Structure 1
């Protein structure tokens, strides 16, 4: 589909990730309250960062929804302008904020696992390697997307037949796909902890 529809799809995917992310945050808090005070070992810092990034991602979603509506109206009118490149900026910032949240949830799961399970049995050793692999992939994808965003905001041909906007859309799609997998990995880890604690 056209770039504006692809951006709609990606925004919807970010919203869906956010719902599940939020469930994971609450799941971790539920587990933590059973087994830890929450007043040592980084947990108050964690609560703060989670709170901030949750606010930030919702604000980014709002900004992206406003731009998406504008872009869809302009498309139906046969215009279109710098709104597509701005929307890639918006979606990249949302992806970055969700990556912070994902990494915070990984930290929380690791603290709980270290407390209430031992070592690498039960699938945990390979979980750790895959978390590190997918986190690695995502950081690479984000950096490339940041570099492409700068290129698109400086170059002249993005809306005149150049490749930069199509390239960037693929970068953002691959980033979200990797983050979908990372979230499935954190869900697995939470479920293992629930089986032990709840």
Structure 2
């Protein structure tokens, strides 16, 4: 069932990307109300959002292609499955960069208009720190497992373990994403 599972992980990544684009929209609404110009790092933010967004689209497109290729070869192919794992990992890392950019943006806006000491903000800040550490450690573990599986291409269990790694990284990203949505709603309700 690895190929099918890879499809579900790819679909989760795509839906997380849409969700991320929505949060980026919300942040831009808020930035237009709170900030003046483009200093404090905002000019760069805008460009980097766009850079990682086009990178992620491109990784999703590559992953789709590999996914179709793997599905056409099910009856024959460890290397296609290992390759797809690399694609999913790269997409997850690019999404993590985007996520860190939205976290930075929410933190800059929050500091202008609200105390960081109340209304759920202290807990928000710890949870962001915790899930950021967790996601980084899962990405590093996925990178190590990916190198091991690639080392074993020269002709099972490493593959299953990497499926678990990817899934757990996607889960932790979803939690980070639900924290960013909460942050945005608190700011929206305050200042719009």
Are residues 57 and 156 of structure 1, via their aligned partners in 2, closer, same or farther at CA, if it must alter by over 3 Å? closer
Give me the whole-angstrom Cα distance separating, in 2, the residues matched to 1:190 and 1:165.
37
Q: Assess if the C-alpha contact under 8 Å between 2:138 and 2:168 holds in 1.
A: yes
TM-superposed deviation, 1:116: 0.9
Aligned length: 192
Q: Assess if the C-alpha contact under 8 Å between 1:32 and 1:38 holds in 2.
A: no
Q: Displaced runs of 4+ in structure 1, greater than 2 A?
A: none
- C-alpha offsets along residues 104-140 of structure 1, whole Å, 9 cap, x if unaligned? 0000000000001122200000100000000100000
TM-superposed deviation, 1:38: 3.9
Q: Assess if the C-alpha contact under 8 Å between 2:92 and 2:169 holds in 1.
A: yes
Q: Assess if the C-alpha contact under 8 Å between 2:79 and 2:153 holds in 1.
A: no
Give me the whole-angstrom Cα distance separating, in 2, the residues matched to 1:156 and 1:74.
17
Instruction: Answer yes or no: is 1:124 the counterpart of 2:118.
Output: no
TM-score scaled to structure 1, two decimals? Answer: 0.94
Q: Assess if the C-alpha contact under 8 Å between 1:152 and 1:165 holds in 2.
A: yes
TM-superposed deviation, 1:23: 0.3
Structure 1: gaps (5+ residues): none
SS for the counterpart of 2:136 is helix
TM-superposed deviation, 1:45: 1.0
Give me the whole-angstrom Cα distance separating, in 2, the residues matched to 1:44 and 1:87.
35
TM-superposed deviation, 1:90: 0.2
Within 5 Å, give how 1:41-120 maps onto structure 2: 41-76=40-75, 81-120=78-117
Give me the whole-angstrom Cα distance separating, in 2, the residues matched to 1:69 and 1:155.
24
TM-score scaled to structure 2, two decimals? Answer: 0.96
